Every structure is written in C-alpha cells, then in structure tokens.
C-alpha cells in the first residue's frame, strides 16, 4: 500500500506530540494520590480510574505518527513492567522526560549516536550505584511491603505471599488460582519445582506464560538420553488414549524422537512437553524417584535394563497441574499417595543422615525441601468475578514484585532514593561533551518521578525535591501522609529491580528513537 | 485501459524522484551501524529494523511513476543480490548515485547512448580490476568472514559452514533443514551430488529453488538414451502406485519418452524430474554404479541386456531427498543401505589402486568425494519460529556469500578497495567525452558505499575517503570500531562477486534507463 | 446510447492527436538499437521492451476520439504485418507521416478524393518500381537473413527454415511445434499438400488460422461429386463412435450432403472438414491413392464400383494432422504404414519413367515431392514456457516472413532503397495537382522510416538520408553498425512484400479517412 515517509525530524516531532500526550494523560494518574481520569465507555456511565495502566491500554490517536510513537512508549513501558511489575506510570513518566529531552538534543544537530552512549553508560552506572544501595529484600516485613505498594497499597496481600513462601520455599512454587467462597485459601500441596523447562517452545500450548501448563497430565520420568520416537510411539499411544496431557522427564531427547515428538504434537496428536532432567549423575536418578514417588510415577532409567517401549499410564507419572517454564518445571497436586510421598521423604531423609558434604547438605536441602514444600496453591476469594479477576491480577502482580525484590532489593519510595542518586551522580560525564549532555538529560528527567507523585497528590514537585536533596539517604517525603522522613519505615518500599527496568528500558527506547533518522507508514486515506 | 503515457524528461524525473527517495530511506541502514527505521505496522508496535532488505520490503509510493521507478530499482538491486549476496543496501546507492547522474546527464542534452557505453565499459574495466585484486577465499577463516559480514556480523555461522565443507566437500552439497532443539546439528550423510540437472524446467515443482527438490523419492538409474514411453508407463505406473516422487537419471530421454512424461506430469500422474546421466562413457556407469549403491537402486544400462519395461520400486533408487539443480542434481540420505554404500566405497578405491591416469585420478577422487562425504545437513537450532526462520535464512544468506567468495575471491571490504580503484582508475576514458563523463560519473558515484557507510554510523564520509586515499590497498577505516588499518585484518571481507554483481546490475539498469524515451502507465484514478 | 457525433476537423483532429500520440510512443523503437521503453504493468517489475509491436499492445486513450483513432491505426497496421510479417514499426511511422500529411491537406481547404488518388497511384507506382527492384529471395543465404531481420536479428532460425524447406519442399509444409528438451528438432515426417482446402469456413474449428486443423483424424478419400447426406451417414456414425475428427477430400460434395455436414457440424455430432480433390482428371484419381497410402486409407472412386454407405474407419485414412487452408490441405504424420508409402512412391517413380510429357513431367514432380518431402515438423526447445512461445512466434514469424520473400523478393534493408526510389519516383504526378501533392507526401514520408531508424540509433536521419542520397542502389548505412555500404551484403534484407504492404495499407488507411467527413462515438461518461 502507498506509503507516507518521513525522514528525520519530520517524523521526530511526529513521535514526540503523540508521546508527551500520552504522558501527559498518564503522569497524573502517579503517586499514591493519582488524579481520577474518566475513561468513556461506550454505553452508560464511563468508567472512573486513577492507574497509568488502565488509561494507558485506553488511547489511540488518529495522528498514526503520533499514535505509533504512543504505541512505542507503550511497548517499552510494558518492556519494563515485565521486568519491573509495577512503576508502570513512573515508567511512562521516565520515557516521556528522556524521549522528549533526547528528541529536542537531536534537533539541536547535536550528535545522536553520543546522546546515546552518554544515556546508556549513565543508566548502567545508576544500575550499579541502586544494587550497591540495594538492601535485600528478605523479611516477611519488606514482602509484606512490596505487596502492598505494587498492588497499590495492599498489605494482606504481600503478607500472605510471605506466608506461602515461609510455609513452602523457593524449591517449590506458589500458584494463584479460583477462589471457592469469598475468602482466600492457602494450601501447602505435595509438588514440587525443579530447575529445568522445555527444550522446545514448540511444546508451549500456553504461549502468553511462557510455560506448558498441563493439567492432570501423564508424566512419564525418564533418566535416559533419548533419540528415537519409535520407542516412544506406544507411550504416546497410551496416553492419547486416556486423553491427558504428556510430560516427559528425560535424561536427554535427541533426533527423531525430538522430530516427531514436534510432528505429533502439530499434528494435535499429544500434548507434550519435554524437559531436562534435573541435575546431572546419581542426584538426577534419585531426583526422578522423587518425582516418581509423589506423582505415583516410576523412573524410566537404563540401570534398571527396562525400555521405553513397555511404559503405560500408571508408570507414567499423574499430577494435577504441571508448569513448565523455560528452564523451570513445577508440579502441583501430584495425584500421587501421599503416605507414600512422606515414605520417599524420609527416604531422602536418612539419605541426609547418610551423607555429609557441604555439596550434599544444600542438594539434599532442595530436594526435601522440593518434596515436602510442594506447591503453595492460593484461592483468591472474592464476590464479583469482575472483583475476582481484579485481585488475582493484583496477586500475580505482587508476587512478581516479590520476586523482583528478594532478587534485586527494595530502596526506598517515592522517588527519594532518586533525588539522592541526583546528589550523588551529578558528577558523572561522558566521553563526548554530548553524552556529558545525555547525562545530565537523564539527572534531570530522573527527578521527575517524585515530582509529578507529588504533583498528582496536589503538592509541589520542586519543593519537595529540594526538601529531600536537603536530606540524604532514606529522608524523603511521603506524598500520601505528605510527610519528611524515613521511607524504610512507613513502609513505601520500591524493589531496585523495578526502577532499574523502568530506566533501563526508557534509555533504550530513547536512544533508539534518538538514532533514527527516517519512517515509513501508511498514508492517511 | 486509458493510459498515463509520459515522454522523455517528463517520465525521467517521475522515476528519478522516487529512486532518490527510496535510496534516502534505504542507505540510512548502509554499514555495521546503519540508522534506525521504524517500519510500520497494520497494528500495536510498528518494527524498528536496520538493514536495507527490510525497509526495501515495505516499501509503495501513491505516485504511480515514482513507485513504479522504485520498483525497477528495487527488482535491479535483487538480480545484484541473486548474483552477489550482500551489498543489498550498497547496491540500493549505487543504484541511486549512478540511475541520478546519468538521468541529469541525459537532461543535459547530452547523448545517451554514450553514456551507456561509458557506463558498461567502464564497469568491465572495474570487474577486470577487481578480478585482478580478487584474492582467492578458500581459507577456513576467510570463508567464516565472509559468513560473517554477510550475516551482518556472525562469525559461528561462516566458521560452521568452513567446517561443514572441510567434512564434506565440493562435490557433496551443504543443505539447511530445520533443527530439532535449540541448538544446529551438521551431518555427514550419505548422499552425493553430480553436475547434471533436470533436463526440462517443466519438472520443477519447486519453482523458487530452480530445482526440482523430491521428498523419500523413487530413483530411476538409467545408463542409456530413451526415446519411448511405451518402456516407461509400467515404471510410472509402480512409483504411482506407491506415491513416492519419482527421478529419472538416464543417458538420454528423447522424443516420445519425453513428450509422455512432460503429459503425465501436467495431469500429475507422477512427479517425475529427469536428469542427465553423469559424465560420459564407462565412467557414467560407474557413477550410475555408485548411485545405485548409495540409494539401494540399481543401474538399467543395455550393457546387463535388461530392459526398462521390468524396472519395480526396489529396482529404482530410494533416497530420502534429492535436490535437481539446472545441471547439476543432489541426493541427500539415500535409503540404501550404508554398509553396502561403504563396500562400494572400497570398491572405487582398489579402482583408484588401479588407474594412475591423472584424468582418472580426479575422476576418482570426485567420485569419492561424492559417495563418502554425501551430504552436509545443517538443522538449525533456535527456540522461536520467527528466529527459527530468521537464524535460517542467514544461514542459506552466508551460504551462498560464501560460494561466490570461494568461485570470485573476497576484496577488503568497508569500501576501502572502492577508493582504492577510484585513485586507480581516475584515468578511465570512453571513445566519446560523453563516456569519458560517464566513466568519471562512476568514479564519483562509487565512493559513495563508503561514503554512506561512514555518515550511517555517524562519522565523516568525505574525510575517511581522503583519509584512505592517503593510504593503498587494503589501508582503510572499520567503521564499526572507525580505525584505520588493513581491513582484511579484522574479517571485513566484501566478496569479489557481491561488489561485482551489484556495481553491473546498477550499470544495467542506468543505461537502460539512460536509454528510455518513453513509457506507459495505467491512469491515477 | 446517446452519442457524440463529430463532424469533419472536429473528428479529424481527434484522429490525428491520438495517431501522433501513438507513433510518438511507438517510433521510438524502430531500428536495430529502438529507443527503451518501460511498459508499467499492474503489479511487480513493468516491462522493458524494444519494439513496437509489444507497446502497441499496450495502448488505451482515455479521450475516445484519439483512442478509436489509434484503433483504426493498429488495425491498418495488423493489416500490413498480415500482409508483411515485419515492419510494424515501419508501417507505425509511415502511417503516422502519411496521415499527419493528410490531415494537414484537408485542413487547407483541399480536395480529400484528389489526395487520395495521388497517394494511391503513387503506391502502385512505387509498388511497380519495388517489385522492378525484388531481385528473388530463394537462396538459403537470403532467407537466413530475411529469417534475421524479421526476428530483429535471427540468423539460425532463417538457416533452419532454409534447411527444412530444402529437405522437405513446397510441396510440402513447414510446421512449428513444440519441442521436447531444450534444442529445437526438424523431422522430415510422412505427409503431403496439396492445393486444395475447405469448400465452407463453416468446417473451420480454428479460426485463428483460417484452416481446419485436426488432430489424429478419419480421412475420406472421394473421387465423386456428392449430393446427399444419405450415403455419408453411416460414415458419419462410424467417424462419431471412435471420436476423431472428420476430413473429406472428395472430387464434389453439393446440396444436401454438404447442407446437412454443416448440420450435423454445427450441432457438434461430428468434426467435418471438406475439401476439393486436388487437380482434375486421373491425376486426381493418383493423388488420391497417394494419400490413401500414406494414410493407410483407401479411395472411394466410382471406378472401382464402391458405394460410399460402407465407407468404415480402416477406410478412411488416419494420419496424426491435418491443416485445411482456404485452397490447401496438408496431412501431418499419416498413420498410414511407412513402407507402403514407400511402395507408393515407388509406383509414382515408375509412373515418371513411364511418361514424358513435360506437363506430366512436373505433375509427378509435384507429387513425388507432396509424398516424399512430406512436412517438415519444428518442435522448438526452450526453457520456460514464456521463452518457448516466445521462441515459436519469432519461428512463425519469420516463416510468414520468407514466405513472403519467396514469392516476392528482397529489396535492400535499412531503409536505403525508400531513399532510393525517392530518387527515382521524385518526378511523379498526379491527374491534379492535390494528386501531385499527395504524391509530395508520399515521397517525402517514404524517407521517414529511415529516418526514425537512425534516430532512435542515436544518430543523425537528414544527414544519413542525405548521404544515402549520394550513393545509389544498395549503397546506404547500416544504423546498428551505423556504417555506409551494401546492405544486401551485410546482411539486411527488407523483403519486397513487406514494405509493399506497410505502404500500401498506409495509403489504404490514409485515402479512406481523409475522405472522412463525420463519425460518431459514445458520450464520454
Ligand atoms: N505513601 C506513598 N507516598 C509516596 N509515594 C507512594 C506511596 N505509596 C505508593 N507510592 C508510589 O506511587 C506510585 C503509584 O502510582 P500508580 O498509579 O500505581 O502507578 P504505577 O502503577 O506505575 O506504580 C507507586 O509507584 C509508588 O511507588
Ligand atoms: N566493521 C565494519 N566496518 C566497516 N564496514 C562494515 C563492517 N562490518 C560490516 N560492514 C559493511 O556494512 C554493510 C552492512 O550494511 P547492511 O545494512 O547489511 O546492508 P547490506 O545488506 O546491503 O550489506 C555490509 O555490506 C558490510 O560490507
Ligand atoms: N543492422 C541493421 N541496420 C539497419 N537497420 C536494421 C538493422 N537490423 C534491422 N534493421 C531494421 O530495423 C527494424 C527493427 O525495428 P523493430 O523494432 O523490429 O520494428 P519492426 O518490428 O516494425 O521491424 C527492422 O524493420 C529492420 O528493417
Ligand atoms: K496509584
Ligand atoms: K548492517
Ligand atoms: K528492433
Ligand atoms: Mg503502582
Ligand atoms: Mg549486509
Ligand atoms: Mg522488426
């Protein structure tokens, strides 16, 4: 189709009057007191929210330019967000300042490529000076606190996720699921979480996870380096008679077994899902007995002599809910005895007692701690299925805030630790008097987060950014109560992983738009 | 339909404005560090891409002229890309330089057919010149710069290609499938390849790889020259039967033979693809020998006394797949059994013990090429199928950069042997001033790849060709890590061939255009 | 439908912008070295060509005065390659000039009959004076290069028809096939013509060709006038229940036998195509037993005493075709047993040594000739099937072309023998003085085909007209070689019914549309 072509600032101002709209609609919803924004329904009475988010998935400009460049900023905000979990405004507030700051420079016939070396090496030295100012993000207090601001302020649910994990661990998983009455239930089910996941997306039928997903499937274990699909087509016949999902647990699949293992499943014969074997040597065996064990399995390994060929629904193994991440497999609700799977426990027990190394010590930690953990399985109740879906989002979305912390660390909210950064990089310089430039664009759009929260909650931006330059390390300013001091202790937590991912991935956005040069799009008919 | 009919310069400029804007968008990607396009799309995130093929792909102009101008440039610079394999966007400004000048020179009042021959002489002198700089690319190491730059910057790939030839050979052929995990795989298979193809295009039933490509096929192996389908229907008939394509090597297939399987292919009867038998005389039966080894098939020659009316299944060869080229046909697994392929390895062997004729003595290594080093496959692994596609057709992308390298030779590549022929052939003249100027309009135009090459990543185009002049032969500019040096020296290999086939392309197509008078177009309604 | 109705120079200047229009795009590639010109298509890569005959195809006007205008100008000029089999270029610029020049002389006032009488008898004259200087294109040399020049220079396809008219004769005929392979082949098969052919073009199931061609067909053989469709209906069942095509050759068919054929033909029961019986007397009686044995058919003559109701398949001759021209039939690849027709050659060479007279004496020549020589069969090889019709119209063409050489001969190509008679025929007059002035134009337009040539060569046409000029007879200028000598010598040969009917349908067109005074079209909405 005929094409409209830009080139240069042409299509930079473009980009830009679309982006600082859209920010312009977005900032004021940042901070724990946004500005209400009335998004019109299409019949009755529209709906009345104050999250960047809801406005943000909301907007379309008839502008394409204006309306692409929205759709990049949008993109990128989601970038973060996956590597963030929330800041989601803050990250919308980031891009605009920078976006906006780098399509000015550029405009200035100033050099592009340098605007984007001074961003990118600024923002790698704020990563490192946030980890060196990130605390980790550990105690049941600080989940409970990340939890709580992710899900915009929402304490019960990051303690509830402290809860799980104490009564669970990292060696299992926590899953969120429907709720049956109208309140939350949490159970410590027999499962288990390794650290190996699909050796094929192909296996994906969940693409949006990232992971299989299977539910009462079979599980067939095997601790064997696999190459043909002959001796695996009786297996896959016993299962796709049963009509249940595959899980395959091997050593190795390799050649044609992988090959038709991939045309059976595009050919919607079987749903398979194939692994690695957790570990390596004799831990990997006795991790497949394991597994053998709570899902009512059996292992599938060459020092036993017995072949593949000869492996039925009962050997294979039978769960209720299997999650197969990239390199990362969950199972939930083993179908499994469960007397049988303490039996196992105790069985790698006296293996604790038997052994000694330090190696040992903390792989057999996993392992019991896989087995008898299991899966936190969470019943988010609620009233409204609307209401339903409403808080398990803000389940999920605080449990990946949690991970991010506990991986990453919190410093403290609101946009202090920021102004404090500000106090600290100012000296920071590139090699060229651009990226010198480029820094300093981002020192001052870097302020801008705490300034538009206290904006959005009716106060002075400036003012309370001088305040806290006037402090230093945790002293900020909470917006909500509008007060001076500590931000470890009221509580407002923002994990290091969450703006790091923001400002990472508003330097890339920016510097990327700050290299281009020419577009092309439809043209407006 | 009524028609738009321009004459002259009325026609000239409506191409030559949409050739300069092509170009304006394209040659911003020229070089390691081309500039940021953000192609866009029917829907959610438009495509930032750097490279000149993808931009060239999205490509369409509402004026009819422009866009149809556009259109020749674009299809010229992918016959240069058919016969070079890279330099897409350096053909794409060349193309642009060279179609703008000898348009305005046309303008002038000045004589095109003079500028023609200027052009076209000039271009040979080049081609002779770079010919005589064409260092040979046969080492494993140039041969993995060349997949190197070709693929943009991917050393593993030319380096797996240097290996996959090392294996297997010249006589044998390197195939790209898909992979099974996410990691490639090569296999030394036993296949072979001849240099005789299908002896009419009507066979081809994959019209895209000018070769007829047949899966699991039926391989007739005929040493003697056909003439009748009435020998033939019975071995139609059996291949029919079983629903294998078919393959004919046969010493000849003339007159009725012919006619008949042409009819029974076009009413799809059987997928039949005949080819030449290789060689001539003794050496093709035995060739047709070691076919019918490799294949599990058997050689029909007069010489047993058989006759082709009593040819089954098991009598025609069985390979997994075979690849018709215009003269030269591949088998890639052949069914027949390998054990027996190696007995008929010995048995080329003592034949080689046997001869001391050097002509026997390439004969027999070829021929032993051909059976034991088979066939190179490559299955690449990648974990999305877009990468999947994306990984592959760098592959395919090297692979044939890498053939016209080892066929031409690699020159030192940034455009540094460019400058360098230009303080060469600055004395170039025509048999008329016209072709003098357009001999000196070459000259300019063809400092420009550098040229742009430099502006894309940022820096100064006229001052590094100064620069390099200043220097001789391979002293140049990377302008990845813009130093100066000897370009061969950092792996910046630019074929002989791709230079060579996109400076001629852009000599045809500006002559040819130098050339035009007039044209017709459909009317803008 | 309400109509537009012009009325004298309102349509005529209507005609002469679109004539003009027309030649202007189309002069442009007259010569060996015709000016570019890129016919844009629909979609994809438009069309580059160089000859006149393919952007003719690809003309429309949206005014529709000019575009009926430039139909009846293609339709003249159809009329003159019909009639020429080349110069369509030629006839383009010698219809524009003629026609410009004509228009011009109405316009001043000035009797249209007298212009048309002038241009007329100055054709004749000129046409007189051509076939004067027709020197006969019968030696293989020249019909090489007639065969040349008609494919705008194809010397093997002239070589080829040269050497298959040698082998086969004019008697016989020349067919064009398709080929097998890649490489044309010329089989010297058993056939026949003769010079008679269908007696209604009702029979004709190809009207493209203006004969009745059947492929594999049932060949009654008559000797008898016939009268009714009586004693052809059982022959008519038994040709209908084998479903071939039907082909009569008998002495007379009348009344109700032929009124009821075209009955049961164009109800579709049988493919019936009569024919005369070629000659008169016995000698008709001889041929039909000729054909009876090359067909394998026998003849149904009064003189043995055999009725025509059991006339049956076996009886009526098979051959593989036959083509019935307008007065000529002529019998491809009879089925007939090759050895009687040996037999049956033999008998007619006894039959020579058995008579004298000179009349008999070419009447067997003839025969031997028809029986023997049979026809010539051309399967043309090519690759793709777009080069193979390609291929198959330039052997058609060329054909027509020495065809039309044979029976009229070769005046010196290039345009020099036009500059020659202008020479000569500069003292040409007319009855009135409007005649003596269209005689002018006829001269002066006679020089402009030349002229283009040289022009779209690039180089000057007054100035090589002029030089011409100072030579005589074949003395002119090669405009590809663009050198002034023989051009029977080197090769360019223009026939003598060629330019013969470009001229004259020139003059055809030119006198009937200045005598023009109103037309009427459709209104333009
Ligand atoms: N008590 C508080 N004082 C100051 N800032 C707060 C307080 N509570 C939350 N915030 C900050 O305000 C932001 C709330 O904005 P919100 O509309 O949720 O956008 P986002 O979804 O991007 O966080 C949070 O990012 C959080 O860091
Ligand atoms: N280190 C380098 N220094 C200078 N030039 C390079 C370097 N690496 C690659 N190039 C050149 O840059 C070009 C990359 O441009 P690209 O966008 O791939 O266009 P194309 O597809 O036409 O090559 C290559 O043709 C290559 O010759
Ligand atoms: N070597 C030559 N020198 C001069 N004239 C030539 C030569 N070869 C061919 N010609 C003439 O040029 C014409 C080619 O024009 P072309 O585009 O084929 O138009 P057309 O199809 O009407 O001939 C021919 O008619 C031929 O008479
Ligand atoms: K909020
Ligand atoms: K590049
Ligand atoms: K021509
Ligand atoms: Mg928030
Ligand atoms: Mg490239
Ligand atoms: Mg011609």
Do not use: W
């Amino acid at each position: 189709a005929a094409k409209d072509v830009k080139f240069g600032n042409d299509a930079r101002v473009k980009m830009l009057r679309g982006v600082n709209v859209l920010a312009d609609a977005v900032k004021v919803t940042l901070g724990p007191k946004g500005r209400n924004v009335v998004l019109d329904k299409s019949f009755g009475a529209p709906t009345i929210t104050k999250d960047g988010v809801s406005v943000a998935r909301e907007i379309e400009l008839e502008d394409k330019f204006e309306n692409m460049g929205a759709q990049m900023v949008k993109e990128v905000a989601s970038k973060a967000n996956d590597a963030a979990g929330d800041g989601t405004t803050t990250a919308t507030v980031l891009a605009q300042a920078i976006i906006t700051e780098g399509l000015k420079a550029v405009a200035a016939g100033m050099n592009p490529m340098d605007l984007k070396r001074g961003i990118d090496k600024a923002v790698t030295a704020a990563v490192e000076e946030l980890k060196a100012l990130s605390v980790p993000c550990s105690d049941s207090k600080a989940i409970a606190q990340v939890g709580t601001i992710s899900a915009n302020s929402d304490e019960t649910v990051g303690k509830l996720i402290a809860e799980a994990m104490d009564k669970v661990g990292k060696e299992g998983v926590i899953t969120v699921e429907d709720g049956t009455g109208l309140q939350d239930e949490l159970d410590v089910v027999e499962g288990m979480q390794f650290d190996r996941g699909y050796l094929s997306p192909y296996f994906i039928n969940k693409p949006e996870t990232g992971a299989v997903e299977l539910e009462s499937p079979f599980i067939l274990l095997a601790d064997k380096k696999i190459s043909n699909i002959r001796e695996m087509l009786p297996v896959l016949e016993a299962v796709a008679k049963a009509g249940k999902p595959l899980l395959i647990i091997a050593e190795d699949v390799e050649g044609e077994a992988l090959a038709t293992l991939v045309v059976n499943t595009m050919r919607g014969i079987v749903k398979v899902a194939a692994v690695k074997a957790p570990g390596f040597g004799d831990r990997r065996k006795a991790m497949l007995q394991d597994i053998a064990t709570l899902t009512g399995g059996t292992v599938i390994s060459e020092e036993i002599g017995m072949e593949l060929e000869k492996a039925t629904l009962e050997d294979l193994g039978q769960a209720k809910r299997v999650v197969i991440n990239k390199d990362t497999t969950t199972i939930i609700d083993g179908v499994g005895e469960e007397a049988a799977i303490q039996g196992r426990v105790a069985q790698i027990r006296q293996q604790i007692e038997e052994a000694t190394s330090d190696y040992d010590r903390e792989k057999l930690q996993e392992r019991v701690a896989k087995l008898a953990g299991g899966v936190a399985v969470i019943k988010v109740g609620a009233a409204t299925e609307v209401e339903m879906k409403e808080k398990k989002a803000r389940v999920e979305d605080a449990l990946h805030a949690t991970r991010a912390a506990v991986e990453e660390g919190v410093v403290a909210g609101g946009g202090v630790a920021l102004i404090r950064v500000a106090s600290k990089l100012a000296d920071l310089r590139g090699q060229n008097e651009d990226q010198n430039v480029g820094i300093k664009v981002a020192l001052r759009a870097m302020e801008a987060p705490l300034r538009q929260i206290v904006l959005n909650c009716g106060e002075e931006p400036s003012v309370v950014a001088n305040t806290v330059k006037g402090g230093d390390g945790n002293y900020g300013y909470n917006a909500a109560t509008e007060e001076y001091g500590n931000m470890i202790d009221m509580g407002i937590l923002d994990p290091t992983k969450v703006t790091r991912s923001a400002l990472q991935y508003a330097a890339s956005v920016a510097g990327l738009m700050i290299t281009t040069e020419c577009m092309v799009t439809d043209l407006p008919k």
